[PDB]
């Protein structure tokens, strides 16, 4: 996008002639056909600019130093827009317009140290612009060398068009994006100078002159003013950009420039001891005046009353002027700038400016002094600015100063905060799809199946890690808020268009999960009766969902892994019975109901104990297991004995009813556990899929059996269905602390299993077909061919080697077939009537190789793969089991207390149908504060932090030592 | 293209087995056997194209350097030898035997399929690296078998 | 022995497969679109026979500069480098202290 | 003389590099190959004539 640059920017022509030599700097001969006192505007013409683009200084540089040629009478707004948007430069939080003739190429050591250490360092810290003359001469060269030594920093250079050496090479009306400039032109004359190579961008002000000084001053001052009228980002929230002028040495021209700047209401910093035109003003401010003008300023015009009148006009607005105290080279630039701006101001606050910059120490010093007395809105505005610009340290500091937050946050302020979403961000899209209207988007993300809370939610939505961290630290429901933040961040990450942005959200979610687990570990180890029993099992304001539900939805495996949560889950598993009850005691109680009242099991009173025992999840699970075993026993009894073509008997009808009750139980589980949503949730579990397929096969088998003609088919289907039902018993081992992880690992071994199966299938096909071709059995029947090609070689893997059916040495020679050759008669039933014996040694050799490969190499390779995988996925499998333990316990917590055979009687019942909390939260907050203090202290005492503090203290000692040495 | 190639190769193996087990007779080749010959010829042309376009000697060596190309070349050479022996009046059985071994050589090529899966390819590489252990075991077992077998044969004196 | 070898050469085998994946893809990128039984019809066909780039390079260079700056900053902030700078600053302070003592 | 820091510093001072390098300078730079070094042998086998040795190494296939 450059064709618009010529449209809005113009260059100037010599046009009218004024006298041999033009007053416009060009020879009378080299003028157009159109050619008293020449006018820079009346006697010139404006044409579209043809020198835009960017500069690529030969070799070194950022390969981009944007240049431009424009008329002096140009509105600075367009220039500022071009610089900020097109060229990519950010808005300047501060602009330092450096002045000073600095007669003589050499400069004082202290001045150079100040520039390289005070000015450039501050500019980089605050992201300021340095505006100078874009020429390799005067103060511009010194500023450029200071920048280079410090090295990036933004150094705008506004220079006239006509005093620039090698201006021809820059001219390209079509554009000059690749521009090559030879700043080192051999001739060295004061008429023209080369553009410095340390400046990021240039503005070649064109006034229709072929060489002159001060022709760009008008544009420079206008741009400075216009910038000073802008705002410091975040839209209009920011304060006016501070623009101040720095002066070193100079002359009468510099004095006039200072006068114009003061007329423009721009603070001026005068360097003490800089030299003439700068020390004169410093002395005048500190306090004969004509004597000072004569001694300090050059003798010419010293007696002239114009100099004294100009000095008087300067002092007329001395509020703007400020002297940079030498202070033996203080090199404390930011504080001096802040003081100068404050003095000039006489809303704009030092706090808002410090927030605009990232210097929190400056604001800390400003607030620390008790002289300043702050009001509510004063701190509220600065806090809003800090929030909008993602400055966690500043918000922390501002809140620390007793700022009331409840009254601070308002619907307008919250709307503004959400409006600060960055351009096209996921939060922005969700808000557009859905005042903030945050509740709707929150429900949409979750599904819907206190200032600190609102601010934490806002920070999470906008993905501001440090701000969200801080808000969580100040929140009330620490553990639940951490889990909810993890859930929300993971949900957003899965819902994000760009993975790299998502990875940040995923990392923040992981960090929040880590903090939640650490805090809950602290709380639990403090007191188990509280914490787990109360913190986890209460329903917070997030979604009125217990913390365990949030952890489950967020897949916060680490949260379930910790011992406190596991102990709580075990306690819930045993219901009211003590978690230490031995299993044998439970079994004895189960088979001897009265023994529940005996002291050998630890926990109307009688009915209370009865329901406590028979309602505990563990006892429901045991009853379900016993009933399932009895069901399998009855199924086998029917299948092996009582199953006949005749109509079903009593036992078979009992089996049908039992299977019907199992079907009803599965229906209940799917129905109650958003009809489609919960149906999918139920169907997602592998065990539920197994149950469903088993019941479907059972129904199909019963249907086939009842039909007169499909009895055998029904029996076969039921025989397979028995295997399907029996496989369900593996679910029992998911409860044991050791077996569940084993089952998970087994489920993960299937890739190795499939690799082995594919390899073995290829090998079996090859070997079997080769052997079948070599033998040439005369059966040649498709089922027989398939048998000999797949079944027999397969069985050979398990020690079933029929040598008599393959080796001719073990068979009887006979002339079975009329075809030419020799034939032998195998004794096997399905070995072919007779096989060729042409090359039987080859058949035996193939058998040898097959035995080797299959039996030894492939099986041992499978063992090795299993060993590797088992060793690799141990920890993840253990974590996954610990996570799904909650799902198991919750599933068995809501099941009917009766077994499937009798569960019909309970499905019928299902058919036809504070201060303590505040104290708990306070105790949680105390523990959170202790945990945060422990972490902070541990970090502070770490070796790296101590080394950093020692380095800082050594630097401070070195600076004080240099100071005292003077 | 890979899936089509895999399906075609499976059908080729199916046809090869069908011919070898049933339609292979001393009589002159039948329709299916001629179809198999044409199919093998097209495979040969494809291997020729791969070697030719992929510095004639340089690219030929580059092609021949791949193990899978070596397997394909040996399979096709065995196929040509078997067909030649079969056509000759006296070498029918020898041709049938050569083709029976060539079927194993062709079928082994299917292992190349697993080189595309994210999990199986590394497994095949590791398997290729297990051969030193395989050879150690084979040498040890050969020594032991020789010793034990000769001792037992000497003791029994059949 | 198989278990040991399998555990030992896992990473190298994975890297080798990831490397040869490109060779596989390139090989199947240039093959005729037809299957071997019909591939004859395609072998017959084979027989009888900017500013965007500059912008891309500039963007690459920007990323390279960012990466180099990140590496340099990480090295400078490392414990060893900070310790070295502290030693140098302590030596400078010691020399200035001896100088002033005179 | 293999002084990376000095070349970095010199280039940093706005030194134009495009005009700096010349066929004579490049010939001198390659002439600085250390005594009997592989690069020296390749150059002898093949002005710098670097393109030929580059093709020989890569093969230009
Ligand atoms: Ca179920
Ligand atoms: Ca090939």
Numbering used by the authors:
A (entry chain A): 7 to 25, 33 to 48, 59 to 174, 182 to 317, 328 to 386, 393 to 480, 500 to 514, 557 to 710, ...
B (entry chain B): 782 to 835, 851 to 954
C (entry chain B): 1042 to 1090, 1115 to 1167
D (entry chain B): 435 to 480, 500 to 514
Which text from the study accompanies this structure?
TRPM4 is widely expressed in various tissues and has important roles such as cellular depolarization, cardiac rhythm generation and immune response. Like many TRP channels, they exhibit pronounced temperature sensitivity, with activities strongly intensifying near physiological temperatures.
The E396A mutant displayed two strong phenotypes compared with the wild type: the loss of the temperature-induced potentiation and the inability to activate at negative membrane potentials. Accordingly, the Cawarm site was absent, despite a pronounced Ca2+ signal at the Ca TMD site, suggesting that the two Ca2+-binding sites are not allosterically coupled. This diverges from zebrafish TRPM5, of which abolishing Ca2+ binding at the Ca ICD site markedly reduced the Ca TMD binding.
